[PDB]
Amino acid sequence: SPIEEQATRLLKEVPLIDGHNDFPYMIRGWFRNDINGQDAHLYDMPIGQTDLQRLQKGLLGGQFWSAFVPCPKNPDKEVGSLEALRQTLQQLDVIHRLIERHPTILQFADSAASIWSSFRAGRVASLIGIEGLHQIADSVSALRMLHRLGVRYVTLTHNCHNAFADAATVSPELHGGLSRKGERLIRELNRMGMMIDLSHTSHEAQTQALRLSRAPVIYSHSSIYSLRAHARNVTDENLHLLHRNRGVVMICFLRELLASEADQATLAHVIDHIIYAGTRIGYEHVGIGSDFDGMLRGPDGLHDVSCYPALVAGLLERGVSEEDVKRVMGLNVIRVLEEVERVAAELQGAGEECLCDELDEVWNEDIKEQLTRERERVRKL
Amino acid sequence: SPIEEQATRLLKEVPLIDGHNDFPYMIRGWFRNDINGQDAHLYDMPIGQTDLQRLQKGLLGGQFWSAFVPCPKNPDKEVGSLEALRQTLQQLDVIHRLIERHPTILQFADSAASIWSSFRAGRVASLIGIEGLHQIADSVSALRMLHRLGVRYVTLTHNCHNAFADAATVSPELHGGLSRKGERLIRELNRMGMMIDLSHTSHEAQTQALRLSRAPVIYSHSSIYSLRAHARNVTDENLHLLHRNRGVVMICFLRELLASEADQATLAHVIDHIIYAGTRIGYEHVGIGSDFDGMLRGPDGLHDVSCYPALVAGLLERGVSEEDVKRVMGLNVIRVLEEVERVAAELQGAGEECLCDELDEVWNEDIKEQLTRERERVRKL
């Protein structure tokens, strides 16, 4: 077919960068983060929608691998929050070990330049994101260390309210959008060069974040509200604010978010959602955010990671121009990460002050007086 | 003086690399990790033995900055252990922010090559270590992420027993040296390229670690037992095993470890301890591990970080040859870090399997059967 060869050519010209895949949590469920002597299984998995053979087959250019851990359910809230931080480092560790053990397929990337150099070499550009601010355990210091470990976006919530923002699927509302801490964290996320992700957050939390953010944000895996009304989808109001923010909505393959009856969902619905957003706010603000391995079953035509060439061919079939299809594939999400890094370099270059944690006093006034007296003795030598 | 100009020349030829300084914990005590608009104080501190002006004055070539947090004292042991992990990321964060905010003085280094390139530029080579395995919260995954954040040595204990090894100052003994987990961790530390530190560990834990380790280890801040008997000092038995291991004992300035009466301690005692070790196991296995800012007061002649030229001049005065003085200053600790990296590259290059954590089952057998059934449906398409 001439349309299939056009899709294959496009997939080789520019990287298709997917916004969210929970394959690291499947490794946690199945192998319990023990991948020693499991290459045969990692290439041909007995479960799920992702493995290293099907990842090659679908011609995927890049991937934001999710380092998700569940919302804490412990009665002791201190332990649950701290347990989420330890589990986050376990998931970041298995993502790094997965990339390092398969250097012919996967290559780590943390920037626009590293995505391209990975794509030139024929590798899947492997980026990292965390799915919820419950993962940092109220520590902005920890968040900066997660950035240093290679995390490049942060979903503000999952399916639970935290100290910073409101989740979409939980009622009643706690903060009514962002908290006062959340507003300060937006500045710190812009300063450090962390990409803001607004999937799983409430409509009011999106509206506030889009007006307050100085860098462009993403929806790593969310769909359109007008076509299918759901708390997880993006309203026409927030789509307009995403345009002004210069962000990208990466369309989700979740069957619940594409249609009212889940088993009726298809590839055509995903294309309808991409075209809706591309028509109304332009094709430079739409992306692909599968959420593969965050679901049991996918839509008809997008059952696993090998099906990306069908999506690219489907968009070209509807009359979306090559330049616009390339934008939806990856050029848009590259631009946002590029602009997030430029905004961070500007704010750091202008010596903007970082956000410090609420740290307890460790020394009493007796200890401080001994130390000051001791310093003045050294001055008198 | 001709001996002072000889010391100054040596300090410019090769970097004096100190094994342990707790200036990051002083920033935690004094500023509470909030150094915004505190440059004047960071250059001229009202407390302690370290600041950025005196650091320049002493002509220090490199420094292993301690990311120490105290042993957990909570009745709930789970919270205390997890709290230590969060505090570790806070201390690593303030060390990184300290280095980045003063790029003319400090430059981050994580290898032998990065130490030299930092020293060519006229910067203090800023490395990182953690003072105790209580800091990782029983997570080997976390430890690998600490390595990725720039930690290059790990003290096995502080003043508390942990799941891996016995501390020196605590009785009764728990494991009697290393635990069965501790023995496995030695292999993993050698594999990842993490330098083992045996300061604060019991005599039996040292003996076992020195025989079991495949890479050379250090004592980041410990002194000689024969000259002054203390649980924290190194015995003649362990000094001999350090020679076979090819490690380095970095001599401590703690007044308790140099003499029986603390106020009698001096620079001459530190030189006696260096010469003792250098005479018996050779000068290629001795270093300098001040422990500045881990004490209120230092010895007479080594009151703060500006006093390193007096130590170099003092060694030359006793008749230690220039080549041997250069070894004690930094060449030895560079070699160990170089050999730790070569051993790691060999073991990783020979595909040695990494140590995985005891992770809980998250999915029940019902969830796994749904996933396998779902996979076979996709296979039949």
Ligand SMILES: [Cl-]
């Ligand atoms: Cl699932």
Ligand SMILES: [Cl-]
């Ligand atoms: Cl103190």
Ligand code: NI
């Ligand atoms: Ni997810």
Ligand code: NI
């Ligand atoms: Ni999700």
Ligand code: NI
């Ligand atoms: Ni210390």
Ligand code: NI
């Ligand atoms: Ni110490």
